[PDB]
Design a protein around this ligand. Structure first.
Ligand SMILES: CC(C)(COP(=O)(O)OP(=O)(O)OC[C@H]1O[C@@H](n2cnc3c(N)ncnc32)[C@H](O)[C@@H]1OP(=O)(O)O)[C@@H](O)C(=O)NCCC(=O)NCCS
Ligand SMILES: CC(C)(COP(=O)(O)OP(=O)(O)OC[C@H]1O[C@@H](n2cnc3c(N)ncnc32)[C@H](O)[C@@H]1OP(=O)(O)O)[C@@H](O)C(=O)NCCC(=O)NCCS
Ligand SMILES: NC(=O)CCCC[C@@H](S)CCS
Ligand SMILES: NC(=O)CCCC[C@@H](S)CCS
Lengths: 243, 243
Protein backbone atom coordinates (compact mmCIF):
# COMPACT_ATOMS: atom_id res chain seq x y z
CA UNK A 1 0.00 0.00 0.00
CA UNK A 2 1.64 3.40 -0.85
CA UNK A 3 2.97 5.24 2.22
CA UNK A 4 2.03 8.73 3.15
CA UNK A 5 4.90 11.22 2.30
CA UNK A 6 6.58 12.71 5.47
CA UNK A 7 6.17 16.37 5.97
CA UNK A 8 8.54 18.67 7.84
CA UNK A 9 5.73 19.85 10.27
CA UNK A 10 7.97 22.26 12.02
CA UNK A 11 8.00 24.39 8.83
CA UNK A 12 4.53 25.71 9.82
CA UNK A 13 5.10 26.34 13.52
CA UNK A 14 6.16 24.74 16.78
CA UNK A 15 5.74 21.01 17.21
CA UNK A 16 6.38 18.60 20.03
CA UNK A 17 6.81 14.77 19.88
CA UNK A 18 5.04 12.62 22.45
CA UNK A 19 5.32 8.85 22.13
CA UNK A 20 2.69 6.25 21.89
CA UNK A 21 2.31 3.55 24.54
CA UNK A 22 2.93 -0.03 23.43
CA UNK A 23 -0.81 -0.64 24.00
CA UNK A 24 -1.58 2.05 21.43
CA UNK A 25 0.85 0.53 19.00
CA UNK A 26 -0.68 -2.88 19.34
CA UNK A 27 -4.10 -1.20 19.00
CA UNK A 28 -3.04 0.61 15.90
CA UNK A 29 -1.69 -2.53 14.19
CA UNK A 30 -4.75 -4.53 14.81
CA UNK A 31 -7.13 -1.85 13.54
CA UNK A 32 -5.21 -1.40 10.38
CA UNK A 33 -5.03 -5.20 9.84
CA UNK A 34 -8.86 -5.39 10.32
CA UNK A 35 -9.43 -2.41 8.04
CA UNK A 36 -7.59 -3.95 5.09
CA UNK A 37 -8.95 -7.47 5.56
CA UNK A 38 -12.60 -6.86 6.27
CA UNK A 39 -14.92 -5.21 3.61
CA UNK A 40 -17.00 -3.22 6.17
CA UNK A 41 -20.63 -2.22 6.05
CA UNK A 42 -22.55 -0.52 8.90
CA UNK A 43 -26.26 -1.08 9.42
CA UNK A 44 -27.97 1.52 11.53
CA UNK A 45 -31.16 0.94 13.61
CA UNK A 46 -32.97 2.65 16.61
CA UNK A 47 -34.47 0.62 19.39
CA UNK A 48 -37.33 1.79 21.59
CA UNK A 49 -36.02 1.31 25.07
CA UNK A 50 -38.72 3.37 26.99
CA UNK A 51 -39.93 0.36 28.96
CA UNK A 52 -36.45 -1.29 29.25
CA UNK A 53 -35.30 1.91 30.83
CA UNK A 54 -38.16 2.10 33.26
CA UNK A 55 -37.32 -1.56 34.19
CA UNK A 56 -33.63 -0.68 34.70
CA UNK A 57 -34.49 2.23 36.94
CA UNK A 58 -37.03 0.34 39.13
CA UNK A 59 -34.52 -2.50 39.79
CA UNK A 60 -32.11 0.06 41.22
CA UNK A 61 -32.78 -1.12 44.84
CA UNK A 62 -32.34 -4.83 44.02
CA UNK A 63 -29.15 -3.93 42.23
CA UNK A 64 -27.90 -1.72 45.13
CA UNK A 65 -28.77 -4.49 47.62
CA UNK A 66 -26.63 -6.80 45.50
CA UNK A 67 -23.76 -4.19 45.51
CA UNK A 68 -23.81 -3.97 41.61
CA UNK A 69 -25.07 -1.02 39.51
CA UNK A 70 -27.42 -2.17 36.69
CA UNK A 71 -26.47 -0.14 33.59
CA UNK A 72 -27.53 -0.81 30.01
CA UNK A 73 -24.50 -2.96 29.13
CA UNK A 74 -25.92 -6.21 30.74
CA UNK A 75 -29.27 -5.73 29.02
CA UNK A 76 -27.40 -5.37 25.68
CA UNK A 77 -25.15 -8.34 26.47
CA UNK A 78 -28.08 -10.63 27.33
CA UNK A 79 -30.10 -9.69 24.18
CA UNK A 80 -27.07 -9.97 21.90
CA UNK A 81 -26.31 -13.39 23.44
CA UNK A 82 -29.80 -14.63 22.69
CA UNK A 83 -29.46 -13.34 19.17
CA UNK A 84 -26.01 -14.79 18.55
CA UNK A 85 -27.70 -18.13 19.11
CA UNK A 86 -30.80 -17.41 16.97
CA UNK A 87 -28.65 -16.14 14.00
CA UNK A 88 -25.43 -18.28 14.20
CA UNK A 89 -23.61 -16.73 11.28
CA UNK A 90 -22.98 -13.74 13.53
CA UNK A 91 -21.36 -16.08 16.03
CA UNK A 92 -18.71 -17.49 13.68
CA UNK A 93 -15.37 -16.74 11.97
CA UNK A 94 -14.01 -17.15 8.53
CA UNK A 95 -11.78 -20.21 8.44
CA UNK A 96 -8.23 -19.46 7.07
CA UNK A 97 -8.99 -21.49 3.88
CA UNK A 98 -11.47 -18.63 3.09
CA UNK A 99 -13.83 -21.47 2.14
CA UNK A 100 -15.37 -22.29 5.48
CA UNK A 101 -16.95 -20.62 8.40
CA UNK A 102 -16.23 -21.89 11.85
CA UNK A 103 -19.40 -21.69 13.84
CA UNK A 104 -18.83 -21.41 17.47
CA UNK A 105 -21.31 -23.12 19.84
CA UNK A 106 -20.27 -20.92 22.83
CA UNK A 107 -21.21 -17.26 23.34
CA UNK A 108 -18.43 -15.11 24.90
CA UNK A 109 -18.70 -11.36 24.25
CA UNK A 110 -16.08 -8.61 24.65
CA UNK A 111 -16.77 -4.96 25.36
CA UNK A 112 -14.64 -1.91 24.69
CA UNK A 113 -13.18 -0.12 27.69
CA UNK A 114 -11.12 2.96 26.69
CA UNK A 115 -8.30 3.28 29.30
CA UNK A 116 -5.47 5.92 29.56
CA UNK A 117 -2.88 3.57 28.22
CA UNK A 118 -5.15 2.72 25.29
CA UNK A 119 -8.11 0.45 24.32
CA UNK A 120 -8.65 -2.89 26.11
CA UNK A 121 -11.48 -5.33 25.24
CA UNK A 122 -12.14 -7.66 28.16
CA UNK A 123 -14.28 -10.72 27.40
CA UNK A 124 -17.22 -12.11 29.44
CA UNK A 125 -17.52 -15.85 28.89
CA UNK A 126 -20.78 -17.74 28.39
CA UNK A 127 -22.85 -14.58 28.38
CA UNK A 128 -25.85 -16.75 27.54
CA UNK A 129 -25.62 -18.44 30.91
CA UNK A 130 -25.25 -15.54 33.33
CA UNK A 131 -28.01 -13.26 34.68
CA UNK A 132 -28.41 -9.46 34.51
CA UNK A 133 -26.90 -8.91 37.95
CA UNK A 134 -24.12 -11.44 37.28
CA UNK A 135 -23.22 -9.76 34.02
CA UNK A 136 -23.52 -6.38 35.83
CA UNK A 137 -20.99 -7.33 38.42
CA UNK A 138 -18.55 -9.01 36.12
CA UNK A 139 -18.63 -6.23 33.55
CA UNK A 140 -17.75 -3.71 36.26
CA UNK A 141 -14.94 -5.98 37.73
CA UNK A 142 -13.41 -6.47 34.35
CA UNK A 143 -13.54 -2.76 33.51
CA UNK A 144 -11.86 -1.80 36.82
CA UNK A 145 -9.09 -4.36 36.28
CA UNK A 146 -8.74 -2.98 32.74
CA UNK A 147 -8.30 0.55 33.99
CA UNK A 148 -5.86 -0.59 36.60
CA UNK A 149 -3.56 -2.45 34.21
CA UNK A 150 -4.38 -5.56 36.21
CA UNK A 151 -6.35 -7.40 33.49
CA UNK A 152 -4.64 -10.63 32.45
CA UNK A 153 -4.42 -11.61 28.64
CA UNK A 154 -6.38 -14.63 29.63
CA UNK A 155 -9.45 -12.32 29.76
CA UNK A 156 -8.80 -10.79 26.36
CA UNK A 157 -9.17 -13.99 24.40
CA UNK A 158 -11.58 -15.84 22.22
CA UNK A 159 -14.55 -13.49 22.08
CA UNK A 160 -17.24 -14.03 19.52
CA UNK A 161 -18.65 -10.52 19.07
CA UNK A 162 -17.81 -7.05 20.67
CA UNK A 163 -20.11 -4.33 22.04
CA UNK A 164 -18.71 -0.81 21.89
CA UNK A 165 -20.71 1.74 23.87
CA UNK A 166 -20.20 5.47 23.70
CA UNK A 167 -23.69 6.28 24.95
CA UNK A 168 -22.15 7.59 28.21
CA UNK A 169 -20.43 10.38 26.22
CA UNK A 170 -22.61 11.41 23.31
CA UNK A 171 -23.22 11.06 19.63
CA UNK A 172 -25.76 9.85 17.28
CA UNK A 173 -24.14 6.85 15.56
CA UNK A 174 -20.71 5.94 14.39
CA UNK A 175 -19.21 3.26 12.24
CA UNK A 176 -17.12 0.89 14.48
CA UNK A 177 -14.38 -1.33 13.08
CA UNK A 178 -14.84 -5.10 13.26
CA UNK A 179 -12.51 -6.68 15.66
CA UNK A 180 -11.31 -9.45 13.28
CA UNK A 181 -11.42 -12.51 13.38
CA UNK A 182 -14.88 -11.77 14.78
CA UNK A 183 -17.43 -10.97 12.14
CA UNK A 184 -19.55 -8.06 13.66
CA UNK A 185 -19.45 -5.35 16.44
CA UNK A 186 -22.40 -3.35 17.83
CA UNK A 187 -21.80 0.33 18.47
CA UNK A 188 -24.27 1.97 20.88
CA UNK A 189 -24.61 5.72 21.11
CA UNK A 190 -26.71 8.11 23.14
CA UNK A 191 -30.43 7.64 23.85
CA UNK A 192 -32.69 10.65 23.11
CA UNK A 193 -36.41 11.25 23.53
CA UNK A 194 -37.95 11.09 20.05
CA UNK A 195 -41.36 11.46 18.41
CA UNK A 196 -42.53 8.22 17.10
CA UNK A 197 -45.57 7.78 14.97
CA UNK A 198 -48.18 5.58 16.53
CA UNK A 199 -50.63 5.37 13.59
CA UNK A 200 -52.32 8.66 14.73
CA UNK A 201 -49.94 11.11 16.39
CA UNK A 202 -46.39 11.18 17.48
CA UNK A 203 -45.58 9.83 20.98
CA UNK A 204 -42.21 10.55 22.73
CA UNK A 205 -40.31 7.34 22.99
CA UNK A 206 -36.78 6.95 24.37
CA UNK A 207 -34.78 5.79 21.39
CA UNK A 208 -31.35 4.02 21.62
CA UNK A 209 -29.06 4.30 18.51
CA UNK A 210 -27.35 1.02 17.31
CA UNK A 211 -24.64 0.82 14.63
CA UNK A 212 -23.81 -2.71 13.64
CA UNK A 213 -20.64 -2.95 11.50
CA UNK A 214 -20.09 -6.37 9.82
CA UNK A 215 -17.75 -8.39 7.67
CA UNK A 216 -19.59 -8.43 4.42
CA UNK A 217 -17.72 -11.54 3.10
CA UNK A 218 -19.49 -13.58 5.70
CA UNK A 219 -22.69 -11.50 6.41
CA UNK A 220 -24.92 -10.08 3.69
CA UNK A 221 -27.00 -6.95 3.85
CA UNK A 222 -30.28 -8.71 4.59
CA UNK A 223 -28.89 -10.89 7.43
CA UNK A 224 -27.54 -7.81 9.10
CA UNK A 225 -30.80 -5.74 8.74
CA UNK A 226 -32.55 -8.73 10.30
CA UNK A 227 -30.10 -8.81 13.22
CA UNK A 228 -30.68 -5.09 14.12
CA UNK A 229 -34.41 -5.52 13.54
CA UNK A 230 -34.55 -8.48 15.98
CA UNK A 231 -32.32 -6.70 18.46
CA UNK A 232 -34.57 -3.61 18.38
CA UNK A 233 -37.53 -5.93 18.95
CA UNK A 234 -35.89 -7.73 21.88
CA UNK A 235 -34.89 -4.44 23.51
CA UNK A 236 -38.46 -3.16 23.12
CA UNK A 237 -39.78 -6.23 25.07
CA UNK A 238 -37.01 -8.15 26.81
CA UNK A 239 -39.55 -10.66 28.12
CA UNK A 240 -39.44 -12.24 24.67
CA UNK A 241 -36.09 -13.76 25.76
CA UNK A 242 -38.19 -15.82 28.17
CA UNK A 243 -39.96 -17.77 25.62
CA UNK B 1 -61.40 -42.06 63.68
CA UNK B 2 -65.16 -42.72 64.31
CA UNK B 3 -67.03 -43.86 61.17
CA UNK B 4 -70.07 -42.19 59.81
CA UNK B 5 -73.27 -44.24 60.62
CA UNK B 6 -74.89 -45.83 57.47
CA UNK B 7 -78.27 -44.58 56.55
CA UNK B 8 -80.94 -46.49 54.65
CA UNK B 9 -81.16 -43.75 51.89
CA UNK B 10 -83.91 -45.49 50.08
CA UNK B 11 -86.23 -44.66 53.02
CA UNK B 12 -86.53 -41.10 51.62
CA UNK B 13 -86.98 -41.88 47.94
CA UNK B 14 -85.45 -43.63 44.96
CA UNK B 15 -81.71 -44.20 44.89
CA UNK B 16 -79.33 -45.70 42.39
CA UNK B 17 -75.76 -47.05 42.99
CA UNK B 18 -73.03 -46.14 40.51
CA UNK B 19 -69.50 -47.32 41.26
CA UNK B 20 -66.34 -45.40 41.55
CA UNK B 21 -63.42 -45.98 39.18
CA UNK B 22 -60.23 -47.35 40.70
CA UNK B 23 -58.63 -43.95 39.89
CA UNK B 24 -61.23 -42.28 42.10
CA UNK B 25 -60.59 -44.74 44.86
CA UNK B 26 -56.89 -44.14 44.76
CA UNK B 27 -57.66 -40.40 44.65
CA UNK B 28 -59.93 -40.65 47.62
CA UNK B 29 -57.38 -42.55 49.75
CA UNK B 30 -54.62 -40.16 49.10
CA UNK B 31 -56.69 -37.07 49.88
CA UNK B 32 -57.87 -38.48 53.12
CA UNK B 33 -54.31 -39.54 54.06
CA UNK B 34 -53.11 -35.94 53.31
CA UNK B 35 -56.01 -34.42 55.20
CA UNK B 36 -55.24 -36.26 58.43
CA UNK B 37 -51.46 -35.87 58.22
CA UNK B 38 -51.05 -32.28 57.17
CA UNK B 39 -52.27 -29.36 59.44
CA UNK B 40 -53.44 -27.13 56.52
CA UNK B 41 -53.48 -23.38 56.25
CA UNK B 42 -54.40 -21.40 53.09
CA UNK B 43 -52.87 -18.03 52.33
CA UNK B 44 -54.77 -15.96 49.83
CA UNK B 45 -53.22 -13.24 47.57
CA UNK B 46 -54.16 -11.39 44.28
CA UNK B 47 -51.60 -10.73 41.61
CA UNK B 48 -51.81 -7.93 39.08
CA UNK B 49 -51.40 -9.67 35.78
CA UNK B 50 -52.54 -6.76 33.44
CA UNK B 51 -49.17 -6.54 31.71
CA UNK B 52 -48.45 -10.34 31.88
CA UNK B 53 -51.70 -10.81 30.07
CA UNK B 54 -50.96 -8.27 27.41
CA UNK B 55 -47.57 -10.08 26.93
CA UNK B 56 -49.32 -13.47 26.64
CA UNK B 57 -51.72 -12.16 24.05
CA UNK B 58 -49.07 -10.41 21.87
CA UNK B 59 -46.93 -13.60 21.71
CA UNK B 60 -49.89 -15.44 20.22
CA UNK B 61 -48.30 -15.47 16.71
CA UNK B 62 -44.90 -16.72 17.94
CA UNK B 63 -46.72 -19.38 19.87
CA UNK B 64 -48.94 -20.34 16.87
CA UNK B 65 -45.85 -20.45 14.62
CA UNK B 66 -44.35 -22.86 17.14
CA UNK B 67 -47.60 -24.98 17.09
CA UNK B 68 -48.11 -24.47 20.93
CA UNK B 69 -50.80 -22.30 22.60
CA UNK B 70 -49.32 -20.03 25.32
CA UNK B 71 -51.77 -20.12 28.26
CA UNK B 72 -51.13 -18.89 31.79
CA UNK B 73 -49.92 -22.24 33.14
CA UNK B 74 -46.28 -21.85 31.77
CA UNK B 75 -46.03 -18.32 33.15
CA UNK B 76 -47.13 -19.69 36.57
CA UNK B 77 -44.78 -22.67 36.28
CA UNK B 78 -41.75 -20.51 35.43
CA UNK B 79 -42.40 -18.00 38.30
CA UNK B 80 -43.09 -20.75 40.83
CA UNK B 81 -39.87 -22.49 39.72
CA UNK B 82 -37.84 -19.36 40.31
CA UNK B 83 -39.45 -18.99 43.69
CA UNK B 84 -38.99 -22.61 44.74
CA UNK B 85 -35.29 -21.87 44.40
CA UNK B 86 -35.37 -18.48 46.19
CA UNK B 87 -37.38 -19.93 49.18
CA UNK B 88 -36.12 -23.58 49.46
CA UNK B 89 -38.32 -24.64 52.35
CA UNK B 90 -41.18 -24.75 49.85
CA UNK B 91 -39.14 -27.14 47.75
CA UNK B 92 -38.65 -29.80 50.44
CA UNK B 93 -40.36 -32.65 52.33
CA UNK B 94 -40.60 -33.71 55.89
CA UNK B 95 -38.23 -36.60 56.48
CA UNK B 96 -39.97 -39.70 58.05
CA UNK B 97 -38.08 -39.13 61.36
CA UNK B 98 -40.26 -35.94 61.64
CA UNK B 99 -37.00 -34.28 62.69
CA UNK B 100 -35.54 -33.35 59.34
CA UNK B 101 -36.51 -31.72 56.14
CA UNK B 102 -35.20 -33.09 52.92
CA UNK B 103 -34.41 -30.19 50.67
CA UNK B 104 -34.54 -31.05 47.09
CA UNK B 105 -32.06 -29.34 44.71
CA UNK B 106 -34.20 -30.10 41.61
CA UNK B 107 -37.45 -28.35 40.64
CA UNK B 108 -40.10 -30.65 39.10
CA UNK B 109 -43.70 -29.40 39.32
CA UNK B 110 -46.99 -31.28 38.85
CA UNK B 111 -50.28 -29.79 37.71
CA UNK B 112 -53.81 -31.02 38.23
CA UNK B 113 -55.66 -32.30 35.18
CA UNK B 114 -59.24 -33.41 36.01
CA UNK B 115 -60.06 -36.33 33.62
CA UNK B 116 -63.30 -38.43 33.32
CA UNK B 117 -61.81 -41.36 35.10
CA UNK B 118 -60.65 -39.07 37.92
CA UNK B 119 -57.79 -36.69 38.87
CA UNK B 120 -54.28 -37.18 37.41
CA UNK B 121 -51.29 -34.97 38.29
CA UNK B 122 -48.63 -35.21 35.59
CA UNK B 123 -45.20 -33.83 36.49
CA UNK B 124 -42.94 -31.55 34.37
CA UNK B 125 -39.31 -32.14 35.29
CA UNK B 126 -36.69 -29.41 35.72
CA UNK B 127 -39.21 -26.63 35.23
CA UNK B 128 -36.41 -24.19 36.05
CA UNK B 129 -34.58 -25.18 32.91
CA UNK B 130 -37.27 -25.08 30.23
CA UNK B 131 -38.64 -22.00 28.44
CA UNK B 132 -42.21 -20.65 28.17
CA UNK B 133 -42.85 -22.33 24.83
CA UNK B 134 -41.19 -25.56 25.98
CA UNK B 135 -43.30 -25.68 29.11
CA UNK B 136 -46.33 -24.74 26.94
CA UNK B 137 -45.85 -27.69 24.67
CA UNK B 138 -45.04 -30.21 27.33
CA UNK B 139 -47.91 -29.18 29.57
CA UNK B 140 -50.35 -29.69 26.70
CA UNK B 141 -48.76 -33.11 25.70
CA UNK B 142 -48.95 -34.34 29.23
CA UNK B 143 -52.56 -33.22 29.66
CA UNK B 144 -53.64 -34.94 26.42
CA UNK B 145 -51.94 -38.18 27.45
CA UNK B 146 -53.64 -37.81 30.84
CA UNK B 147 -57.05 -37.49 29.26
CA UNK B 148 -56.37 -40.40 27.00
CA UNK B 149 -55.36 -42.82 29.74
CA UNK B 150 -51.99 -43.02 28.02
CA UNK B 151 -49.94 -41.29 30.75
CA UNK B 152 -47.34 -43.63 32.25
CA UNK B 153 -46.76 -43.68 36.16
CA UNK B 154 -43.28 -42.64 35.33
CA UNK B 155 -44.70 -39.13 34.72
CA UNK B 156 -46.62 -39.02 37.97
CA UNK B 157 -43.60 -39.24 40.22
CA UNK B 158 -41.38 -37.15 42.39
CA UNK B 159 -42.89 -33.70 42.03
CA UNK B 160 -41.89 -30.97 44.41
CA UNK B 161 -44.94 -28.70 44.37
CA UNK B 162 -48.38 -28.82 42.49
CA UNK B 163 -50.29 -26.08 40.67
CA UNK B 164 -54.05 -26.54 40.55
CA UNK B 165 -55.84 -24.19 38.17
CA UNK B 166 -59.58 -23.74 37.99
CA UNK B 167 -59.36 -20.30 36.38
CA UNK B 168 -60.75 -21.80 33.14
CA UNK B 169 -64.04 -22.56 34.95
CA UNK B 170 -64.71 -19.90 37.56
CA UNK B 171 -64.51 -19.01 41.18
CA UNK B 172 -62.89 -16.62 43.44
CA UNK B 173 -60.55 -18.74 45.59
CA UNK B 174 -60.65 -22.16 47.13
CA UNK B 175 -58.62 -24.04 49.65
CA UNK B 176 -56.70 -26.87 47.85
CA UNK B 177 -55.37 -29.92 49.69
CA UNK B 178 -51.61 -30.42 49.88
CA UNK B 179 -50.49 -33.31 47.85
CA UNK B 180 -48.32 -34.90 50.59
CA UNK B 181 -45.34 -35.56 50.81
CA UNK B 182 -45.06 -32.19 49.07
CA UNK B 183 -45.38 -29.26 51.39
CA UNK B 184 -47.52 -26.66 49.41
CA UNK B 185 -49.93 -26.38 46.38
CA UNK B 186 -50.99 -23.18 44.55
CA UNK B 187 -54.63 -22.92 43.58
CA UNK B 188 -55.39 -20.39 40.82
CA UNK B 189 -58.90 -19.15 40.17
CA UNK B 190 -60.49 -16.76 37.74
CA UNK B 191 -59.03 -13.36 36.78
CA UNK B 192 -61.42 -10.36 37.02
CA UNK B 193 -61.00 -6.67 36.23
CA UNK B 194 -60.73 -4.86 39.58
CA UNK B 195 -60.35 -1.32 40.88
CA UNK B 196 -57.04 -0.85 42.43
CA UNK B 197 -56.01 2.19 44.34
CA UNK B 198 -53.09 4.00 42.82
CA UNK B 199 -52.50 6.62 45.56
CA UNK B 200 -55.15 8.93 43.94
CA UNK B 201 -57.98 7.07 42.24
CA UNK B 202 -58.87 3.55 41.44
CA UNK B 203 -57.50 2.07 38.17
CA UNK B 204 -58.91 -1.17 36.63
CA UNK B 205 -56.28 -3.83 36.87
CA UNK B 206 -56.69 -7.47 35.83
CA UNK B 207 -56.33 -9.37 39.06
CA UNK B 208 -55.49 -13.14 39.30
CA UNK B 209 -56.60 -14.95 42.54
CA UNK B 210 -53.97 -17.28 44.20
CA UNK B 211 -54.69 -19.66 47.11
CA UNK B 212 -51.59 -21.23 48.52
CA UNK B 213 -52.33 -24.11 50.93
CA UNK B 214 -49.32 -25.31 52.99
CA UNK B 215 -48.14 -27.85 55.52
CA UNK B 216 -47.90 -25.74 58.60
CA UNK B 217 -45.49 -28.17 60.39
CA UNK B 218 -42.86 -27.25 57.88
CA UNK B 219 -43.99 -23.73 56.69
CA UNK B 220 -45.00 -20.94 59.06
CA UNK B 221 -47.47 -18.18 58.41
CA UNK B 222 -44.88 -15.54 57.60
CA UNK B 223 -42.91 -17.71 55.12
CA UNK B 224 -46.08 -18.42 53.26
CA UNK B 225 -47.27 -14.73 53.13
CA UNK B 226 -43.82 -13.95 51.75
CA UNK B 227 -44.13 -16.64 49.06
CA UNK B 228 -47.50 -15.25 47.74
CA UNK B 229 -46.17 -11.70 48.06
CA UNK B 230 -43.09 -12.56 45.93
CA UNK B 231 -45.17 -14.53 43.47
CA UNK B 232 -47.58 -11.58 43.04
CA UNK B 233 -44.54 -9.36 42.48
CA UNK B 234 -42.99 -11.70 39.90
CA UNK B 235 -46.28 -12.01 38.02
CA UNK B 236 -46.63 -8.22 37.99
CA UNK B 237 -43.18 -7.91 36.26
CA UNK B 238 -41.90 -11.24 34.97
CA UNK B 239 -38.72 -9.55 33.73
CA UNK B 240 -37.51 -9.68 37.32
CA UNK B 241 -36.81 -13.40 36.67
CA UNK B 242 -34.09 -12.15 34.33
CA UNK B 243 -31.97 -10.65 36.92
C1 LIG C 1 -20.64 -1.74 33.69
C2 LIG C 1 -19.70 -0.71 33.07
C3 LIG C 1 -18.47 -1.45 32.58
C4 LIG C 1 -20.35 -0.08 31.84
O1 LIG C 1 -21.39 0.83 32.22
P1 LIG C 1 -22.27 1.64 31.16
O2 LIG C 1 -23.35 0.77 30.65
O3 LIG C 1 -21.29 2.24 30.25
O4 LIG C 1 -22.89 2.75 32.09
P2 LIG C 1 -22.24 3.92 32.97
O5 LIG C 1 -22.86 3.82 34.30
O6 LIG C 1 -20.76 3.89 32.84
O7 LIG C 1 -22.72 5.25 32.21
C5 LIG C 1 -22.68 6.57 32.80
C6 LIG C 1 -24.04 7.24 32.68
O8 LIG C 1 -24.42 7.42 31.30
C7 LIG C 1 -25.61 6.63 31.04
N1 LIG C 1 -25.59 5.97 29.70
C8 LIG C 1 -25.03 4.79 29.40
N2 LIG C 1 -25.40 4.36 28.19
C9 LIG C 1 -26.20 5.34 27.73
C10 LIG C 1 -26.80 5.33 26.47
N3 LIG C 1 -26.57 4.40 25.56
N4 LIG C 1 -27.55 6.40 26.20
C11 LIG C 1 -27.65 7.38 27.08
N5 LIG C 1 -27.06 7.39 28.29
C12 LIG C 1 -26.31 6.35 28.65
C13 LIG C 1 -25.66 5.57 32.14
O9 LIG C 1 -26.89 4.85 32.33
C14 LIG C 1 -25.10 6.36 33.31
O10 LIG C 1 -26.10 7.16 33.94
P3 LIG C 1 -25.95 7.55 35.50
O11 LIG C 1 -24.64 8.25 35.66
O12 LIG C 1 -27.12 8.45 35.67
O13 LIG C 1 -26.08 6.24 36.19
C15 LIG C 1 -19.38 0.45 34.08
O14 LIG C 1 -19.10 0.04 35.43
C16 LIG C 1 -18.15 1.27 33.70
O15 LIG C 1 -17.00 0.91 33.93
N6 LIG C 1 -18.52 2.43 33.13
C17 LIG C 1 -17.61 3.40 32.52
C18 LIG C 1 -17.95 3.71 31.05
C19 LIG C 1 -17.50 2.64 30.05
O16 LIG C 1 -16.31 2.48 29.82
N7 LIG C 1 -18.42 1.91 29.41
C20 LIG C 1 -18.04 0.91 28.44
C21 LIG C 1 -19.18 0.01 27.99
S1 LIG C 1 -18.82 -0.82 26.41
C1 LIG D 1 -51.71 -26.14 28.80
C2 LIG D 1 -52.99 -26.73 29.38
C3 LIG D 1 -52.63 -28.05 30.05
C4 LIG D 1 -53.53 -25.81 30.48
O1 LIG D 1 -54.11 -24.63 29.93
P1 LIG D 1 -54.75 -23.47 30.82
O2 LIG D 1 -53.67 -22.59 31.34
O3 LIG D 1 -55.66 -24.17 31.74
O4 LIG D 1 -55.59 -22.70 29.73
P2 LIG D 1 -56.81 -23.13 28.80
O5 LIG D 1 -56.45 -22.69 27.44
O6 LIG D 1 -57.17 -24.54 29.05
O7 LIG D 1 -58.03 -22.25 29.36
C5 LIG D 1 -59.26 -22.03 28.65
C6 LIG D 1 -59.57 -20.54 28.59
O8 LIG D 1 -59.75 -19.98 29.90
C7 LIG D 1 -58.71 -19.00 30.15
N1 LIG D 1 -58.19 -19.05 31.55
C8 LIG D 1 -57.22 -19.85 32.02
N2 LIG D 1 -56.81 -19.47 33.23
C9 LIG D 1 -57.58 -18.41 33.52
C10 LIG D 1 -57.52 -17.70 34.72
N3 LIG D 1 -56.76 -18.06 35.73
N4 LIG D 1 -58.39 -16.69 34.82
C11 LIG D 1 -59.23 -16.44 33.83
N5 LIG D 1 -59.30 -17.13 32.68
C12 LIG D 1 -58.45 -18.15 32.49
C13 LIG D 1 -57.59 -19.34 29.17
O9 LIG D 1 -56.57 -18.35 28.95
C14 LIG D 1 -58.40 -19.80 27.97
O10 LIG D 1 -58.86 -18.70 27.18
P3 LIG D 1 -59.15 -18.91 25.61
O11 LIG D 1 -60.15 -20.02 25.48
O12 LIG D 1 -59.71 -17.59 25.25
O13 LIG D 1 -57.80 -19.19 25.05
C15 LIG D 1 -54.11 -26.86 28.29
O14 LIG D 1 -53.68 -27.37 27.02
C16 LIG D 1 -55.25 -27.79 28.68
O15 LIG D 1 -55.18 -29.02 28.58
N6 LIG D 1 -56.31 -27.10 29.09
C17 LIG D 1 -57.53 -27.66 29.66
C18 LIG D 1 -57.86 -27.11 31.07
C19 LIG D 1 -57.03 -27.70 32.21
O16 LIG D 1 -57.20 -28.87 32.54
N7 LIG D 1 -56.14 -26.93 32.84
C20 LIG D 1 -55.35 -27.44 33.94
C21 LIG D 1 -54.23 -26.51 34.38
S1 LIG D 1 -53.65 -26.91 36.07
N1 LIG E 1 -8.60 -5.18 20.52
C1 LIG E 1 -7.64 -4.61 19.81
O1 LIG E 1 -6.47 -4.71 20.17
C2 LIG E 1 -7.97 -3.87 18.52
C3 LIG E 1 -8.98 -2.75 18.61
C4 LIG E 1 -10.48 -3.14 18.76
C5 LIG E 1 -11.44 -3.29 17.54
C6 LIG E 1 -12.74 -2.52 17.67
S1 LIG E 1 -13.32 -2.46 19.38
C7 LIG E 1 -12.68 -1.12 17.13
C8 LIG E 1 -13.96 -0.38 17.45
S2 LIG E 1 -14.22 1.10 16.44
N1 LIG F 1 -52.54 -37.22 43.19
C1 LIG F 1 -53.40 -37.92 43.91
O1 LIG F 1 -53.58 -39.11 43.66
C2 LIG F 1 -54.13 -37.28 45.08
C3 LIG F 1 -54.95 -36.04 44.80
C4 LIG F 1 -54.17 -34.71 44.57
C5 LIG F 1 -53.88 -33.69 45.71
C6 LIG F 1 -54.28 -32.26 45.40
S1 LIG F 1 -54.05 -31.87 43.65
C7 LIG F 1 -55.68 -31.92 45.80
C8 LIG F 1 -56.04 -30.54 45.29
S2 LIG F 1 -57.49 -29.81 46.12
Amino acid sequence: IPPIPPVDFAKYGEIEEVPMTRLMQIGATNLHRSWLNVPHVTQFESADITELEAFRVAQKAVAKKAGVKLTVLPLLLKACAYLLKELPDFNSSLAPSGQALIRKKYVHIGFAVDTPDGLLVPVIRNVDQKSLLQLAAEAAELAEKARSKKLGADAMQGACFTISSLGHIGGTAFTPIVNAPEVAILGVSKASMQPVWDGKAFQPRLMLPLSLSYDHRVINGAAAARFTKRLGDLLADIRAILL
